Design a protein around this ligand. Structure first.
Ligand SMILES: N[C@@H](Cc1c[nH]c2ccccc12)C(=O)O
Ligand SMILES: N[C@@H](Cc1c[nH]c2ccccc12)C(=O)O
Ligand SMILES: [Mg+2]
Lengths: 660, 651
């Protein structure tokens, strides 16, 4: 559903201006009720946010909305003064307003112009209210309640002489969504989360080898590249805990297989995304304030491409691997690469003591023993050599050139605007997961690296791509990568190719169409006005390749689960193309087989409702003495067949090099 | 009344939810999304006001052809449906930007040319049938915009909602506006029949009053005494001699509507005036005549008295000595086109009969052709209700209310009365020569004569439901030299006090228009523009909106009356202060004077710089904004300055 806003009219001549601004900012008009209306009569349960309009004179139902309701409230002028009390003269004149950039003022430049309609201001402010903004005149322009979701502005955002009025109203809408997403959680948690900070940062690979079994189900979410703003944390754990479970899914059957600490495999004939939504709602646990990350344990694993059968796609091909595979992590180790410390997370059932407090104690001793001095740290045409000596692509060059030709025909007939045509390469190897991964992470250090060691398969990911980062507050971020340029080797040819990638209209167009596609997916589950693009066509360089990256953000609608958001956006637009449904049908025909783990999502669903998912690219799947890795690229009207083939070989190089 | 219901047909493409967002933000209401494989039988198409047809790689055909509703086709349709060609573009372009140049018409209203748009097509429109018309072109010479010349169909061969496009929200709002215009038009079984003859001669306006209208009897002269391009162009003259003509007056005391037929009998009706006017305009609806370059379709010409506030948001604190409303139902009018130099004659028959309307046109056409060959302090005996000492204390009282936060701005006015041995026409002749204005008016009614030298636009409302208000607030006198005027118009635009006085009224009128206008439609295209007339320099701001569907022209006037530029903010509480301190009625002054067209259009001035003649005495209102920064002596002197035009004309 969309969000519901109550606009309380205090009988001033500005209520209808606020009506317009709320309407434009939130995409839904507020329900207007008079101040002297009956409170007990009003269906306040139906409403999700109150805007208290300016009134004449000094600070009826706007009092009850603040004290009792418990709903998000925005006080405008006399509503602001109302919040200040319950807990020089300028009319139609402008002041420069300076602020901290928090809550209703986020995104706004300091200063910004606003008009004031008052002779009275909040001089002595109560201890439970903090000021957020001041006029050049030196009176309080913004305030907040430190616990309750209450906000005040001592100016008219909707005044013609004011700037960023719509933004302030969009910010209040955003604050109210996050408040109602945080109210869903109560005393309903079936687990107690124990946290322990250890003041050592051992090498992540020492933690994997030293703390995790070696044999059995393990996960390692590996920030092998650490850069301020891009990546900060690594996560590791195993299935040895008493409350830990391993979950698999087959589309063909449509059954969820679940292995507990009983040893029993439970078969449920249902869809995975609904299964996950249900478990995540039932197993809800609130985020810890002591943690600088929002992964407070939960599900770690991958969603395979073929899960499209439950989204907007057809079950055309069977994967030989599970279509979904997740460890429910009851215990995990978190490395903070910025601050140089560790966090130990362990689940106890809210009533019981299942040795969670004991695991924190034991693994803390182990980790301090691994803390030792941190050790010391390709171009074309050799990058475009082959897939390796023992390797065999599903489609050889000729077969792939014909699939590209078929893509160009489908685009000429106007069936697709962009096709992400991919190939699958299978090479025999006797290599074990961890040694092979140790070589890969050294070759291609990356923000979204991962080693999953599951019974059916090992996943060795050197992905740099963010699919969905969802906060517990309902904030969504997607960083689609599309537009690739090889490295030069010669640092002259390299920075030349980097500049070529940012400038070429072809690559910009490849990226833009995916930005529009991901915007569309997000808009289907996000609040009207929340979906925006703060960064377009940023260049990111990694050991193997130069990548064109765009950033899309949104805010989930109330009643939309984190699982619902991923379903709406799965499979990733950056791995399908536009329009998605018809493009995935073209992909089904030309690829003549499954993608499997490749072009799916890999990451975690937290018990806090937060999530962080990568796109599975630059990944080796190890199963039964065989390494298989996907490679692909965008086909558009302007594409050259030879160049597009060469691009799939280049993208394989990190995986080809790791294997030998 | 209600908000517009937009339908969005989903043609199975990854663009629908982006269009959903942009329609939502632009119109303030999310569209209903319907799959293209829906059943048109079961679909309640009657409940929807507009259709957006999403791009594709169904019921879209029935939407454009059958439905007969406003349609915006984006990318994928209208071209091919009306026997147009779908031919290959010079270069296929998917997610590729181009500069779009356009005429600035319909969906392109207010967009700069060029603007940037993203394209997702390999096919374009080469040839276009007579019925279709191109509105926009790309930088590689491809049609980017079209419309049907009759049916309300618009085509856009780019994605407005694409991240790489600009002014996408503006395009969807423009389409919403056009959809409101189509639905306001289709509503306008007519009781009357409108006859129009163009006469390519322009006589002197004052000689048409003397020659064509009688010296005694009920007459009107809407006088563009000042004529400037895009400000004033037309003058309207008429009398009550017609067979269907009616004189209509109202009293707030009784709440009685008195209508006087051309037979001579007067029929009385107990009904709130705005509810009567709405009811009559709804009954007497006659479509716009596109032969006419003006919107006045015949109808009611007259004034709304300040005391009508008792039936809007105000209290009946004082009874006007004059009628609280007074309108001549003009069945016959002379229209002067000062730009093109021709006269238009409008005459009204009843649908059933022929009452010599065709005859009146031919006769007065010969009369006008004949005339065009001939002619192509407050005063010495004046008495203010409040003398200086009294008016200064009413300002002191205004300042008390402002310090106690009861009002942000009070428009405190005085009423001046002076005896005169002068008749309506000679006095107005002097007044219009002294102070040429766009909204000059001579209304000669039985109870009173109204001599308006108002430059101020209250509400200009088109038949398409487009509303404009130009509130004036911030005044300065003229100077002796041209160099003195430049200083004073520079000073008026610069002072914080005058800018504040004006801004608060802009916020007030925006609020009034938003109560009756579509979400997103209300904007201020011009803020703090200085206009110069004979008596003073005026600080003027322009406000625009579009009426909600099911909001009458009369309903819009009711919601905005009295004008914010003559009350202050907040209007309800400030009008109570005015009631207390003025100790009597304003009457015609600070009311609204103009016309209500049978087409649903209206053009109303604010009554300022106006003399009322009744019982052989002249009376005129003057006032000004009182704010926290107001000096009493200065505010009083301001009222004496604004009297100069009325005082010089009387002397
Ligand atoms: N880079 C993430 C953690 C992470 C590493 N590899 C991943 C793979 C999938 C999901 C998350 C991750 C962070 O800093 O918080
Ligand atoms: N100036 C208006 C007509 C007009 C003149 N005086 C008026 C007084 C009231 C209303 C309208 C008018 C026009 O050109 O169209
Ligand atoms: Mg602004």
């Amino acid at each position: 559903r969309h969000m519901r806003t109550l606009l309380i009219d205090n009988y001033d001549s500005f209520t209808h201006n606020l009506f317009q601004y709320i309407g434009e900012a939130t995409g839904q008009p507020p329900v207007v009720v008079p101040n002297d209306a009956d409170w007990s009569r009003l269906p306040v349960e139906d409403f999700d946010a109150i805007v208290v309009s300016p009134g004449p004179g000094s600070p009826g139902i706007s009092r009850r909305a603040i004290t009792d309701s418990g709903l998000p409230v925005l006080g405008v002028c006399l509503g602001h003064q109302g919040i200040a009390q319950l807990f020089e003269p300028m009319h139609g004149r402008v002041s420069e307003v300076r602020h901290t950039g928090e809550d209703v003022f986020r995104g706004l430049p300091s200063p910004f112009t606003a008009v004031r309609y008052h002779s009275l201001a909040a001089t002595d402010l109560p201890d439970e209210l903090e000021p957020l903004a001041w006029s050049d005149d030196g009176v309080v322009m913004g305030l907040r309640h430190r616990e309750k979701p209450l906000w005040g502005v001592q100016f008219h955002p909707e005044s013609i002489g004011s700037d960023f009025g719509r933004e302030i109203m969009a910010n209040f809408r955003d604050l109210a969504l996050a408040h109602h997403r945080a109210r869903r959680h109560g005393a309903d948690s079936p687990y107690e989360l124990h946290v322990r900070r250890v003041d050592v940062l051992p090498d992540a690979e020492e933690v994997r080898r030293g703390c995790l079994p070696g044999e059995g189900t393990t996960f390692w979410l590996d920030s092998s590249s650490v850069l301020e703003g891009a990546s900060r944390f690594s996560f590791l754990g195993d299935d040895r805990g008493p409350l830990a479970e391993y979950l698999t899914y087959r589309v063909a059957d449509g059954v969820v297989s679940v292995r507990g600490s009983d040893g029993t495999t439970t078969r449920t004939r249902r869809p995975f995304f609904n299964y996950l939504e249900e478990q995540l709602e039932r197993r809800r646990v609130p985020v810890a304030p002591e943690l600088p990350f929002e992964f407070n344990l939960g599900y770690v694993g991958y969603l395979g491409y073929e899960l499209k059968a439950e989204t907007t796609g057809d079950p055309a091909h069977r994967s030989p691997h599970p279509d979904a595979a997740f460890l429910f992590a009851d215990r995990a180790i978190a490395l903070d690469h910025q601050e140089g410390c560790c966090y130990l997370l362990a689940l106890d059932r809210r009533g019981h003591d299942d040795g969670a407090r004991a695991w924190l104690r034991e693994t803390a001793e182990t980790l301090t023993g691994l803390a030792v001095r941190a050790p010391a740290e390709f171009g074309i045409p050799e990058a475009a050599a082959g897939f390796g000596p023992l390797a065999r692509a599903r489609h050889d060059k000729d077969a792939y050139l014909k699939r590209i030709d078929e893509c160009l025909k489908e685009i000429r007939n106007g069936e697709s605007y962009e096709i992400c045509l991919t190939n699958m390469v299978t090479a025999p190897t006797e290599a074990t997961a961890l040694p092979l991964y140790s070589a890969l992470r050294a070759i291609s250090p990356v923000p979204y690296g991962a080693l999953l060691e599951f019974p059916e398969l090992s996943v060795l990911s050197a992905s740099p791509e963010r699919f969905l980062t969802i906060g517990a507050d309902g904030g969504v971020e997607s960083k689609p990568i599309k537009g690739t340029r090889p490295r030069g080797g010669t640092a002259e040819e390299d920075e030349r190719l980097r500049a070529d990638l940012a400038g070429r209209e072809k690559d910009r167009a490849e990226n833009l169409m995916i930005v529009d596609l991901v915007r569309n997916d997000l808009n289907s589950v996000c609040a009207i006005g929340s979906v925006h693009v703060p960064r377009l066509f940023e260049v990111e360089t990694y050991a193997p390749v130069h990548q064109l990256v765009s950033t899309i953000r949104g805010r989930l609608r109330p009643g939309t689960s984190t699982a619902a958001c991923v379903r709406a956006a799965f499979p990733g637009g950056s791995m399908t193309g536009a329009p998605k449904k018809r493009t995935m049908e073209i992909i089904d025909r030309l690829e003549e087989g499954p993608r499997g783990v490749y072009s799916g999502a890999l990451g975690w669903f937290a018990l806090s409702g937060a999530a962080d998912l990568s796109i599975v690219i630059r990944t080796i799947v190890l199963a039964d003495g065989q390494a298989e890795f996907g490679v692909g690229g965008a086909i558009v009207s302007l594409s050259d067949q030879e160049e597009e083939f060469t691009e799939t070989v280049v993208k394989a190089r990190a995986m080809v090099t790791a294997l030998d």
